[PDB]
Design an enzyme around this catalytic site. Sequence first.
Site, PDB file in Angstrom:
ATOM      1  N   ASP A  10     -35.882  83.993  32.156  1.00 18.11           N
ATOM      2  CA  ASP A  10     -36.439  85.243  32.246  1.00 18.11           C
ATOM      3  C   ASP A  10     -37.345  85.406  33.247  1.00 18.11           C
ATOM      4  O   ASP A  10     -37.808  86.373  33.384  1.00 18.11           O
ATOM      5  CB  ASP A  10     -36.891  85.478  30.961  1.00 18.11           C
ATOM      6  CG  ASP A  10     -38.007  84.805  30.271  1.00 18.11           C
ATOM      7  OD1 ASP A  10     -38.482  84.291  30.920  1.00 18.11           O
ATOM      8  OD2 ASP A  10     -38.266  85.034  28.839  1.00 18.11           O
ATOM      9  N   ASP A 116     -34.039  76.496  23.361  1.00 17.03           N
ATOM     10  CA  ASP A 116     -33.656  77.549  24.327  1.00 17.03           C
ATOM     11  C   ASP A 116     -33.589  77.050  25.690  1.00 17.03           C
ATOM     12  O   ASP A 116     -34.799  76.795  26.177  1.00 17.03           O
ATOM     13  CB  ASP A 116     -34.350  78.964  24.254  1.00 17.03           C
ATOM     14  CG  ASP A 116     -33.586  80.025  24.771  1.00 17.03           C
ATOM     15  OD1 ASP A 116     -32.439  80.144  25.439  1.00 17.03           O
ATOM     16  OD2 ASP A 116     -34.060  81.138  24.662  1.00 17.03           O
TER      17      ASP A 116
END
Length: 205
Positions: A10, A116
Amino acid sequence: ADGRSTRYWDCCKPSCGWAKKAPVNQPVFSCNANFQRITDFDAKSGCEPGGVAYSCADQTPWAVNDDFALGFAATSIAGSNEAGWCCACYELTFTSGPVAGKKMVVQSTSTSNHFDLNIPGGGVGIFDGCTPQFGGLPGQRYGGISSRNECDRFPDALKPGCYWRFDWFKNADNPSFSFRQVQCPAELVARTGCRRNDDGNFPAV
């Protein structure tokens, strides 16, 4: 312990990049929009309006050989907290998908047992820091890109980590794993600058 994995990128300042989070020598490095390290650990996150600090491109995975890789993750560990996992390292043995039996050592750089994995093109998800950083990355907001040829359009600093998903990781979809805490390898600390004061309490790989 057992856990499940996902993938993301991100562009946001990592959560272990702030001071006073954990017993470390220095927090994880953040970078400016041009992928250069910055030395102000209090700098405002690029995922907030007016921010200037982003994730660095060298905090990406690579292959040591066909059976072993190194990289980074955002972690949540059942019963623990950021003071316990920030800049800690873990040895993952995958137990499902096309990577079953392969091993990976990761350093936690951000925040059930869920890891993640940092993978450029894995999807920006809820926060999109990549649009303010440099105009955005290809892919669906949730899920990222689907084929290896889409890596060709990424900024050069993020290409190695994009291809690793298809090459070493065989495009595995959220494989499960077993894990244990280990001393961080030197190669990982060289990239983040962050070593925990308790790293002498764990086995080596």
